Amino acid sequence: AATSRPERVWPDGVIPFVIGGNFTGSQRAVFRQAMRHWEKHTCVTFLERTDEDSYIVFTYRPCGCCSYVGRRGGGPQAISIGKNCDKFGIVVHELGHVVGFWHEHTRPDRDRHVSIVRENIQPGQEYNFLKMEPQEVESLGETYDFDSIMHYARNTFSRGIFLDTIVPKYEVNGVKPPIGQRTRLSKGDIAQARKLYKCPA
Ligand SMILES: [Zn+2]
Ligand SMILES: [Zn+2]
């Protein structure tokens, strides 16, 4: 679910940042580790902010969606971090939003790849399953990626732990594809981010 909107792509892949107050040294180190993870796999770079108008701010705040997707422009944009939601993989996911990715399940073509099990969605949480309009996403020729760091788990926003809200529609390399990993960028996330930022092949 890569943004189609050119203005949301950070110029030259450069993303200035500020780390806010109220974090421990270990939390701050995890933010830097997550930024380095994006840097080592793509041409995105993170720069300590000086006077740039647009930048990201790691902000002590309650956990919960949503980080702005791509570059907002005209000022800072916050990534909300708290005790519930500060691990490396969570931060890498939020930086996927900053880079310009919506949730994978919101791709306009998602219905070919996953079933959204409406019977199981927590009342009032249905909005989390809305597809992006087709004009808002351009997937750059990349296939739907079950392994994406941007993919929800099978029971995200479910009524029940064993009641799936998202079910992959087919197997990949002879297995039901697991969804919802928050350990590292997938091969597909990297390939697609490199296309989005026109990283030299
Ligand atoms: Zn997200
Ligand atoms: Zn993707």
Side-chain angles (χ1 to χ4, degrees), residues 1-175 177-201:
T3 183
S4 64
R5 301 304 190 176
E7 70 280 15
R8 290 187 183 234
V9 179
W10 291 85
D12 302 316
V14 177
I15 307 179
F17 74 89
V18 170
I19 297 172
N22 216 35
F23 293 115
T24 63
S26 167
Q27 283 176 136
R28 297 197 299 272
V30 169
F31 304 155
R32 298 183 177 276
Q33 190 190 5
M35 289 187 279
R36 286 193 307 275
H37 186 246
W38 271 97
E39 293 183 335
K40 70 184 73 180
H41 287 114
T42 72
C43 62
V44 173
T45 54
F46 291 90
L47 178 64
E48 314 267 342
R49 189 255 179 179
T50 47
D51 69 349
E52 290 91 341
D53 190 62
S54 299
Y55 57 103
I56 71 174
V57 184
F58 295 86
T59 299
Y60 181 96
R61 257 184 188 173
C63 299
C65 205
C66 297
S67 290
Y68 196 89
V69 172
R71 182 183 181 276
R72 185 155 64 184
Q77 63 195 74
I79 302 181
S80 291
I81 309 283
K83 256 74 218 281
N84 237 340
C85 62
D86 65 350
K87 285 175 172 191
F88 170 82
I90 296 313
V91 180
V92 171
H93 172 101
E94 292 306 326
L95 293 169
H97 290 309
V98 168
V99 164
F101 295 96
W102 304 91
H103 291 138
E104 197 78 0
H105 76 280
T106 76
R107 286 169 55 128
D109 70 344
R110 67 101 180 276
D111 291 320
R112 194 159 65 87
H113 299 104
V114 293
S115 298
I116 302 311
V117 191
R118 295 185 180 285
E119 294 82 355
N120 292 339
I121 299 169
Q122 286 168 30
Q125 298 299 318
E126 305 81 4
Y127 70 93
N128 292 290
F129 299 88
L130 290 166
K131 295 186 288 193
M132 297 308 291
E133 290 304 292
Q135 296 86 356
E136 302 304 334
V137 165
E138 167 46 57
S139 294
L140 304 158
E142 292 293 306
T143 55
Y144 188 99
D145 182 10
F146 298 104
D147 197 47
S148 178
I149 198 96
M150 307 309 294
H151 205 294
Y152 273 7
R154 65 193 296 164
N155 61 359
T156 299
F157 295 115
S158 186
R159 284 192 291 119
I161 191 161
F162 297 125
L163 290 167
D164 290 343
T165 48
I166 298 173
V167 184
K169 285 190 167 184
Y170 54 82
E171 300 188 2
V172 175
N173 289 303
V175 301
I179 50 170
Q181 65 89 19
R182 299 292 184 276
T183 53
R184 73 288 183 275
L185 292 167
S186 68
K187 295 187 177 320
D189 288 327
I190 290 162
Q192 193 171 217
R194 286 174 183 169
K195 286 176 163 179
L196 179 61
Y197 278 84
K198 296 182 183 293
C199 306

